[PDB]
Amino acid sequence: VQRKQFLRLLQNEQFELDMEEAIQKAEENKRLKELQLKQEEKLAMELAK
Amino acid sequence: MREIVHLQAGQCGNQIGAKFWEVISDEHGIDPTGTYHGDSDLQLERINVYYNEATGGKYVPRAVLVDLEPGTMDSVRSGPFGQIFRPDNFVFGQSGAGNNWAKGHYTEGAELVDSVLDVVRKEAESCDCLQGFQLTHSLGGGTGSGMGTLLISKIREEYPDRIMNTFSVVPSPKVSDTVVEPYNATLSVHQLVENTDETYCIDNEALYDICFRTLKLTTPTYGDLNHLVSATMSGVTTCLRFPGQLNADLRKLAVNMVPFPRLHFFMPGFAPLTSRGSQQYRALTVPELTQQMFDAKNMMAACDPRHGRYLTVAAVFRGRMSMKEVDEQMLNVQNKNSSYFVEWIPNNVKTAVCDIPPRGLKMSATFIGNSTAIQELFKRISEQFTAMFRRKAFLHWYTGEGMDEMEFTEAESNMNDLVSEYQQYQ
Amino acid sequence: YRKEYIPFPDHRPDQISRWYGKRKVEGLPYKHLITHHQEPPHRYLISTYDDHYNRHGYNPGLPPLRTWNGQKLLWLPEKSDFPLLAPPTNYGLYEQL
Amino acid sequence: MRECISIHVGQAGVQIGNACWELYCLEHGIQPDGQMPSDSFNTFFSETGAGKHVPRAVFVDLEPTVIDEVRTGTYRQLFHPEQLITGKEDAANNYARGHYTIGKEIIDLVLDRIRKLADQCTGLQGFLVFHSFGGGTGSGFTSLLMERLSVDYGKKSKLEFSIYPAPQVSTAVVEPYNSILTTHTTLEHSDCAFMVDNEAIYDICRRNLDIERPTYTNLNRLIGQIVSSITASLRFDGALNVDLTEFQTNLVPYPRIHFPLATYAPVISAEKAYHEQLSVAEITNACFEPANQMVKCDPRHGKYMACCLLYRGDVVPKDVNAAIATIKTKRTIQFVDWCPTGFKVGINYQPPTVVPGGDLAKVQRAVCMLSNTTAIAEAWARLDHKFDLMYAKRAFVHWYVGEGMEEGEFSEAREDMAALEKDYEEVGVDS
Amino acid sequence: QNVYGPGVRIGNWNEDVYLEEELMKDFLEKRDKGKLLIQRSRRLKQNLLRPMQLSVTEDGYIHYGDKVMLVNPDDPDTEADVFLRGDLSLCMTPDEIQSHLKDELEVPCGLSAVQAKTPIGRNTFIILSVHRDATGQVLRYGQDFCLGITGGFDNKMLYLSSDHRTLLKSSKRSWLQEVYLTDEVSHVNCWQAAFPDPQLRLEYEGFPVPANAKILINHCHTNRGLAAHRHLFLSTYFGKEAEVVAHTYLDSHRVEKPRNHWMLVTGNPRDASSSML
Ligand SMILES: Nc1nc2c(ncn2[C@@H]2O[C@H](COP(=O)(O)OP(=O)(O)OP(=O)(O)O)[C@@H](O)[C@H]2O)c(=O)[nH]1
Ligand SMILES: Nc1nc2c(ncn2[C@@H]2O[C@H](COP(=O)(O)OP(=O)(O)O)[C@@H](O)[C@H]2O)c(=O)[nH]1
Ligand SMILES: [Mg+2]
């Protein structure tokens, strides 16, 4: 019983950590894709000029 | 001051009793540690009804928690509110009944009842003025129906001048989780009729209807079903715990609901239930509560009250609130639905008002109803009982434990006499 | 038997799908089932006797005199539908205990 | 605390128990040395002060050539040196040889070992037996075993796992002789009797897993998956648990009716499982389909008498009820008149585990059906029709009558099987 | 039919969107206000696992006020089959459940033995005198001294304590006498250092104790040695730890067992963050 309560509390900790990584990954994807599009358009402008 | 003693049995009774003590601890501001952490002072004026004082300022429930299967004792203890429950208050056996009323009532549960009678007597005599007893169990299981009815017979002989309320889980009409479930429930209704003062019928499929249509949920599991019935449990003993304009306890409800000793099979309802999308867009007002209360979709039983006739109606209102609109709306529904009410009892409706609403909600109402439409619940299982008993099947698990054949015949005979007694007064 | 039954050292059983299942069957809490209008639990603890006799009907928000509503009929400022949500009823019981 | 004792008798029993105990080791995370890597396991393994875990089962056979591979295999350290009872010479496809002559000198040793195991056990759910009718040991010595367990322990549950002889393909000439005479022990000294045949599993593995040539190795894995799905309710925490007394109570309406059929779903490969979505309705109608029957008989001719469903994984009690309601409206599926609510549901949280290098896929949810139906009377009719055809000219009878038994056992056994068939039709007729 | 999930607009999706938005808003509000359980555990872990330095001796004698380390040496025992291997360190241990639910440490705290080598914020005891005002003194054999631990905290000081056996107070697993940490000052905080070999014990009584040497630690009021149980495991938020009790263990020759031997460990002069090991 004591070990089961300890496991339940640790699973709560794992749930909060999973929520934190899920709320970080989307912003990481957004910044990477925005940087990619900006670099692509700058290279296109310079080559055309 | 007027303490009530909670009692539970079976797997269903344990999973609903843990949820019952969660809302009371939230209502009285009791932390999962065991102390008190609240902001008002009316929560401590009547806290001895459910909670016993101890050292450390620790309030512990006045409940006994019994199951023949030790598997469910872990989940109650390892739940979010498991350390509040007293470790002495768990009584368990080594082997489960396994959906058999014969083992649960005559052989396996016959030795554990003497061990738990010491526990329930110790809790009863510790109260200065015991209000009564309250039980929640399930008729579809061996432990809840076999041994829970054994406690009903033993407590009734030991405390005759008391009041006993039961919250029994009736078998579901559409989907049945047990093949021998008509045997386990028919043999328990016969013991229920003559040894119980109030009986409420709760079915899981009508809980699913409320969670599908009224709540608009996609996964409302057994836990979310337990939240609805636990609010009804907390709402029916409201005036004992909190002061109000017009108080009515369990006995004051019983004296207005039971015109004959064979008519005590009720069907509950909880009024303020909405959806998450429509949460902010409807005003919580007395006409809105009384419109949702009397509808059949809100009701907590597998019986349509249109097919029958209402006999006597209860309503327990909570919150700071006014009495002209209560009396006007609840005379209006009696005036308009004259065909749905009996004419041999005038003023079929009883009104109770409290001051303190449930937490997070402005105003609440609990419906307790006696109706002759509850006889079609017994008609469905009786025709299932007969259709199985004609071929004498699944019987060697019942006659192999010392039960005679006549017990089934007297069980169907009293139960047919009960539905004939409901039909005459219709 | 010797070809197929090999030790498999790297395999460990899963221990998290069960615990996700426990919470998915445990279900939504009270705040997401029944709690209405996002009300904090400190405001609605108040009694009729304490509101009418102890506080003498003290509500600074409402004007002392009623005015006709206009668009809706009857008089707008009404005491009954507009109660007080002050700090709750308190006295020496908690301190004495 | 709650634990069951496994008896694996015969070559089929030993080879099934190998895969079953390997699956138990993989499920509880037990290395082949015998330890956990550097209390749900308590129902099968005993805790030593060294941390070593040993199983609470016995492997009995009359030949050493099947057990010596276990003694010299990968799992030599795990199994107890004494829990593997070996004989001297095999029964050699005979009933009287394994019943009256060879089974007598090892029954004392097996009884002593299981008495020590029952001394170990503080709470005992029952005995799960694994054997084959077509063998000599599994037909003869098993009869003595159940007849002795009935005297030794009174009301303990007896769950049975029999290798039924397939209707067309088979491996022995005198298999009807060895199959008629064991029904006497399995009729009153057994509580419930699950039946499997190898031809149906070949049929399953041909068109469901896309493997053309299977073996006993990847047949016993499916059998062990069934046994794991049965015992998972006792092993693991679930919403609705089923105990060994529970389904054994709910699946028999009469003492002479204790023969269900076992089915499993889904059974599908790793390539297919990524693209085929697996919902509860789609896994609960597949086990109702007759092509997924694991005994070679069609339940469309018969009537479903009782059912039991065991679910594993991320399953919610809603689409279970919705799919049961959907199933209840199918006119192809027929029920008896006296069993209107013929369903029983048990649910376990843990998803099924897969063996590396295996054929089955990683799956989130699974279900096994244990269904008692009337369609086994056709199988018994075929088997005793073959018995009557072979008995017509008195073939192979001297091998039985010279060993010590009386020739009247054949006639009384045929009469008992005829009476059992008659009782099956008397049960199956409606009121 | 078929189900799709969160983003796809089919079936009952509006209520799922409302519920997910409500849950995300509630989680964001809780983690903004700082009531996150992982944040509380992170604060507790950084409070308890903070490194520090250890005192460095010159002449090899233990001086008062030095920050020392209590280490049970390793011995090839044959009592059981599984037990902790290597030297163990005496570390404080709070209750796991109460530690998760409440931020503040509770008195009394339990103790344990952990496979820890570096001086961490859990197992560094300073040595004080009951007389106080002891500057540059020498701890001597058979003399009273007391042990204090800050436990990674700059607020309070706790002392080792033990008491006589009672039916309500016992050790967690071994059911023998128990040792805990309390802030109260009494005579139940008093310990003595003794020589292991019983023949030369009274001859070496009254001499300055060496550093990094095997000595016995005895309670003054109960006369029980500080024993480390290796064969009994304690589950803990920081893993699996050996047990610690107060009992005197004797062999057939009435010689103290390797369970009762304890070493005081100082800091390395070349690297203060490391010990003599
Ligand atoms: N499904 C399955 N069946 C098996 C397996 N091993 C053996 N069998 C069955 O066993 C039957 C042959 O009889 P056995 O059980 O091997 O014979 P026995 O019990 O050792 O008795 P004796 O032959 O006298 O030694 C075959 O028809 C198979 O159906 C197996 O690994 N899986
Ligand atoms: N409403 C509700 N019903 C439940 C819950 N748990 C189980 N049940 C019902 O209880 C029935 C099984 O009862 P059972 O366990 O056999 O009773 P016992 O043998 O006395 O423990 C099932 O059909 C479920 O539908 C719950 O938490 N809430
Ligand atoms: Mg053999």
Coil, helix or strand at residue E225: strand
Give me the CATH code for the D261-375 domain, please. 3.30.1330.20
Chain center to CA of C70: 35
Distances (CA, A) of C56 to B42, B200, C53: 19, 42, 5
In the 8-state DSSP scheme, what is residue B310? E
Per the DSSP assignment, residues forming a β-bridge with B371 are B310
Cα D18 to ligand 1 centroid, rounded to whole Å: 14
- Interchain contact, E36 vs A13, CB within 8 Å: no
Chain breaks in chain D (C to N over 2.5 A) after: 38
3-state secondary structure B325-369: HHHHHHHHHHHHCHHHECCCCCCCEEEEECCCCCCCCCCEEEEEE
Q: Which tokens in the block code for residue E105?
A: 């440490």
E108's tokens = 């009394």
CA–CA separation, B143 vs B66, rounded Å? 9
Largest CA distance in chain A: 73
Residues B225, B230, B235, B239, Cα dihedral to 10°: 180
Closest partner residue to E80 (CB to CB) among D49, D277, D279 is: D49
CATH class, range D376-430: mainly alpha
Continuous segment of H or E residues that includes residue B158? helix B148-158
* Residue B87, preceding peptide bond in cis (omega within 30° of 0): no
How far is residue B299's CA from residue B228's CA, in Å, rounded to a whole number? 11
CB-CB contact of E242 with E84 (8 Å): yes
Say if strands B51-52 and B60-61 run parallel, antiparallel, or are unpaired: antiparallel
Residue B254 neighbours by CB distance under 10 Å:
18
Tell me the C-alpha distance between B198 and B233, whole Å.
13
d(CA B218, CA B350): 36
Q: Between B and C, how many CB-CB pairs are < 8 A?
A: 99
Residue D75 DSSP label: T
Distances in Å between the Cα of D430 and the Cα atoms of B381, B387, B391, D261, D344 are 20, 11, 9, 21, 22
Which residue, among D317, E21, D349, C32, has the nearest Cα to B227 in the 3D structure?
A: C32
Contact B309, B373 (CB under 8 A): yes
Q: Are B235 and B341 in contact (CB under 8 A)?
A: no
Chain B contact set for C25 (CB, 8 A): 221-223
φ/ψ (deg, to 5) at B61: -70, 150
Task: Give the atom of ligand 2 at the shortest distance from the alpha carbon of B137.
Answer: 20
Note whether A15 contacts C23, CB cutoff 8 Å: yes
φ, ψ for residue D326, nearest 5 deg = -65, -40
Residue with tokens 């358009």: A41
Chain A contact for B70 (CB, 8 A cutoff):
no
Residue B141 CA to residue D72 CA, distance in Å, equals: 49
Ligand 1 contact, D372 CB (< 6 A) = no
Write down the H helix ranges in C1-97.
17-26, 30-33, 48-49, 93-96
Residue of B391, B395, B396 to mutate when probing chain D, most D C-beta within 10 A: B391
Cα of first residue to Cα of last residue in chain B, in angstroms, is: 40
What is the CATH code of the structural domain delimited by D2-260? Answer: 3.40.50.1440
Residue B170's closest CA among B193, B148, B139, B131? B139
- Closest to D315 in 3D by CA, of C18, E210, B256, B41: C18
HEC letters along B3-53: EEEEEEEHHHHHHHHHHHHHHHHHHCCECCCCCECCCCCCCCCCCCCCEEC
**D245·B387 Cβ contact <8 A:** no
One-letter amino acid for residue E9 of the chain: R
Instruction: Write out D202-251 in H/E/C secondary structure.
Output: HHHHHHCCCCCCCCCHHHHHHHHHHHHHHHHHHHCCCCECCCHHHHHHHC
Measured between alpha carbons, how far is E77 from E83 in angstroms, rounded to an integer? Answer: 9
Measured CA to CA, the distance from residue D30 to residue D41 in angstroms comes to 9
Bridge partners of E92?
E111
Centre of ligand 2 to C-alpha B111, Å, is 23
Q: Which of D202, D203, D134 is nearest to D171 (CA)?
A: D134
Residue D11 CB less than 6 A away from ligand 1: yes
Beta carbons within 8 Å of B259's beta carbon, 6+ residues apart: B311, B312, B345
CB contact under 8 A, A5 and B74: no
Method: cryo-EM
Pairwise CB contact (< 8 Å): B181 & D341: yes
Among the four given CATH numbers 3.30.70.1560, 3.40.190.10, 3.40.50.2300, 3.40.50.1440, the one describing domain B3-257:
3.40.50.1440
- The secondary structure element, H or E, covering residue D86 is strand D84-86
Pairing state between β B2-9 and B63-67 = parallel
CATH no. for B375-425 = 1.10.287.600
> Would you tell me how many other CB atoms lie within 10 Å of the CB of residue D95?
24
List the one residue out of D78, D81, D86, D29 whose CA is nearest residue D61. D86
What are the extents of the domains in chain B? Answer: 3-257, 265-374, 375-425
Q: Which of E27, E101, E233 to mutate to test the interface with A (most CBs of A within 10 A)?
A: E27
Q: What angle do CA D315, D320, D321 make, to 5 degrees?
A: 145
CA distances from D183 to D23, D142, D143, D177, D179 (A): 30, 11, 9, 11, 7
Helix (H, G, I), strand (E, B) or coil at D63: coil
8 Å CB contact between D85 and D113? yes
Tokens matching residue B134: 């309250």
Whole-number Å distance between alpha carbons of E250 and E258:
10
| DSSP strand pairing (E226-236 vs D345-348) | unpaired
Q: What CATH architecture applies to the domain B265-374?
A: 2-Layer Sandwich (3.30)
Question: Are residues B137 and B9 in contact, defined by beta-carbon separation less than 8 angstroms?
Answer: yes
Backbone φ and ψ of D115, nearest 5°: -65, -40
* Residue E120 phi, psi (nearest 5): -115, 170
Question: Which DSSP category does D289 fall into?
Answer: S
Q: At B166, phi and psi to the nearest 5?
A: -130, 140
Write the DSSP symbol of residue E254: S
Token couple for D200 = 């149906």
Query: Would you kindly state where each structural domain of chain D is located, as residue ranges?
Result: 2-260, 261-375, 376-430
CA distance B329 to B336: 10
The span from the CA of E177 to the CA of E191, in Å, is 15
CB atoms within 10 A of CB B374: 25
Which of chain B's residues have a Cβ under 8 Å away from the Cβ of E16? 218
For residues B61 and B84, the answer to whether their CB atoms sit within 8 Å is yes
| Residue D12 and residue D163 in contact, taking contact as beta carbons nearer than 8 Å | yes
Please give the structure tokens belonging to residue E160. Answer: 């080792």
Residues 17-76 on C with a CB inside 8 Å of A are 19, 22-23
From the alpha carbon of D61, which atom of ligand 1 is closest? 20
**E 74-93: CB under 8 A from D:** 80-82
**Side-chain half-sphere exposure of D36, counting CA atoms within 13 A:** 14
Report the alpha-carbon distance of residue D179 to residue D193 in Å, rounded: 14
Distance D74 CA to ligand 1 centre (A): 22
Q: Does any CB of chain C come closer than 8 Å to the CB of residue A12?
A: no
Q: Using CA atoms, how far apart are residues C35 and B361, in angstroms rounded to an integer?
A: 6
Answer whether D90 contacts ligand 1 (Cβ < 6 A).
yes
D134 in contact with ligand 1, CB cutoff 6 A: yes
Q: Which residues pair with D372 in a beta bridge?
A: D306
Q: Is residue B191 lining ligand 2, measured as CB closer than 6 Å? A: no
Mutate to test the interface with B, among A5, A8, A12, A15 (most CBs of B within 10 A): A5
Tokens 């086994």, located at residue: D376
β-bridge partners, E208: E140
Q: Which amino acid is at D28?
A: H
Is D3 tagged catalytic?
no
Q: Resolution, in Å, please?
A: 4.1
Indicate the DSSP class of residue D361: -
* β-strand partners of B8: B65, B136
Structural element, H or E, at residue B352 = strand B349-353
Neighbours of E223 (CB within 10 A): 10
Chain B residue with minimum CA distance to C46? B356
CA angle B137, D124, D122 (to 5 degrees): 100
Of B198, B92, B111, B195, nearest to B153 (Cα)?
B195
Q: Which of D239, D307, D338 sits opposite B388 (nearest CB)?
A: D338
Residue linked to tokens 């010299």: D72
The candidate with the shortest Cα–Cα distance to B209, out of B280, B85, B299, is B299
Set D246, D378, D409, D421: catalytic member: D246
Tokens read off for B233: 């449990």
Pairwise CA distance, residues D227 & D21, whole Å: 10
What does the DSSP 8-state code read for residue D97? I
Check pocket membership of B138 for ligand 2, CB cut-off 6 A.
yes
Query: Smallest Cα–Cα separation from B187: which of B417, B363, B37, B411?
Result: B411
